[PDB]
Amino acid sequence: KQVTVYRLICKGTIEERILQRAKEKSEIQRMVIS
Amino acid sequence: VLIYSQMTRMIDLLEEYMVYRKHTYMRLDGSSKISERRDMVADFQNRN
Amino acid sequence: LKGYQLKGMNWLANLYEQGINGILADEMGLGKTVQSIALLAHLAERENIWGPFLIISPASTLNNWHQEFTRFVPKFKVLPYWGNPHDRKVIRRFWSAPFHVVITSYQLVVQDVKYFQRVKWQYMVLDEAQALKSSSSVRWKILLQFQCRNRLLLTGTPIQNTMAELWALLHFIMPTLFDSHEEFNEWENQLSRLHMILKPFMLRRIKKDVENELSDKIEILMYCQLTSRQKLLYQAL
Amino acid sequence: LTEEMLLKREERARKRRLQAARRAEEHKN
Ligand SMILES: Nc1ncnc2c1ncn2[C@@H]1O[C@H](COP(=O)(O)OP(=O)(O)O)[C@@H](O)[C@H]1O
Numbered sequence: 001k002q003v004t005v006y007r008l009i010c011k012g013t014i015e016e017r018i019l020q021r022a023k024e025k026s027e028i029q030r031m032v033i034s
Numbered sequence: 035v036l037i038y039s040q041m042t043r044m045i046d047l048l049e050e051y052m053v054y055r056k057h058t059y060m061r062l063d064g065s066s067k068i069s070e071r072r073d074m075v076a077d078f079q080n081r082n
Numbered sequence: 083l084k085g086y087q088l089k090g091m092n093w094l095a096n097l098y099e100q101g102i103n104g105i106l107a108d109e110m111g112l113g114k115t116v117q118s119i120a121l122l123a124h125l126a127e128r129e130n131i132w133g134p135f136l137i138i139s140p141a142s143t144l145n146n147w148h149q150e151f152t153r154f155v156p157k158f159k160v161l162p163y164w165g166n167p168h169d170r171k172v173i174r175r176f177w178s179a180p181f182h183v184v185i186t187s188y189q190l191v192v193q194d195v196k197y198f199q200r201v202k203w204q205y206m207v208l209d210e211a212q213a214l215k216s217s218s219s220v221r222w223k224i225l226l227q228f229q230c231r232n233r234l235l236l237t238g239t240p241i242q243n244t245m246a247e248l249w250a251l252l253h254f255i256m257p258t259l260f261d262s263h264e265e266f267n268e269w270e271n272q273l274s275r276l277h278m279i280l281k282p283f284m285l286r287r288i289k290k291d292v293e294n295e296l297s298d299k300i301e302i303l304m305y306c307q308l309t310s311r312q313k314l315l316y317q318a319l
Numbered sequence: 320l321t322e323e324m325l326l327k328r329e330e331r332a333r334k335r336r337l338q339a340a341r342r343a344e345e346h347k348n
Contacts, residue, residue, distance in 0.1 A: 001297065003296075004301075005300070005301045005302065006302045006304055007302070008306055009303065010307070010308050011308070032241065032273065033280075034288065068141060068165065069165075071141075072347075073348055075145065162346040172342055
């Protein structure tokens, strides 16, 4: 089947920092394996 | 659908919502007993 | 069994003869339990039968293992080990070795150590071993002391944090080869060193090579605007 | 003489294995 995935995040509050640190980690987490 | 959330305090608010708009729902906090998890997973498979 | 699983079995069998521990770091949804169970399913050698296995795992997962052993390998017999102290005490009588395998939770193995020290387990399957990632943890300190042929880690999306956790996981896998975090300050200058160190023990798959029949995840980020009541409180903070 | 303690311990063995059967099947659900 399909799979869809959603994030709900507020404009400009604080949750953006969480998303930024997650994004920063996510690419480092690739290159150290493949 | 699966809904994931990061505060038990919030999963309580979500449960109040799932009861109000009558969707049917089932919840598995870390506070659930190990035996409950078995039934609750086996009921999310095997049913529409 | 699927082709990549069978190649996994031949690889694990090589490591088994060589006496080598490692990480079966396949991406989640490819059958990492099924691969570990195949160390018994095709196991005509009998060595793996008449001495007990441990499966050690995080709490919600204790169920699936029972169903997976009973569906794939009815040749075996399996012991629960969770719940009431009474049931634990009772089950300790049955393994006082037709008790071929025992299913266990990290939170119990870090307490009932005295009982687990009583028997020479053949192998430990530490399921979802990303649980062990910090060497400061009692879990890590204690789980180092159990004696067995192999320690087998089935954790997908492994490592991936900071080099202290790399040392902790790798030194859990091998008691030799690693002495301190200083080696891992000298180990593409960094990346290539780590790759070559991991390659003899650290399988991979990546979903797009094998999950060819699955849809890709459509991933949405949805921005939301907070309400008047939220503005008032957020501002007051 | 010895048969009493032997058949007692045999009865304890089937008692144990009945509890093993029951408390193993408590894992079903
Ligand atoms: N060869 C196979 N035959 C049947 N089911 C399989 C097979 N390989 C994988 N699966 C299924 O895929 C899932 C594997 O889960 P698990 O063993 O935890 O793998 P992973 O850790 O990659 O998610 C289960 O639903 C299992 O039934």
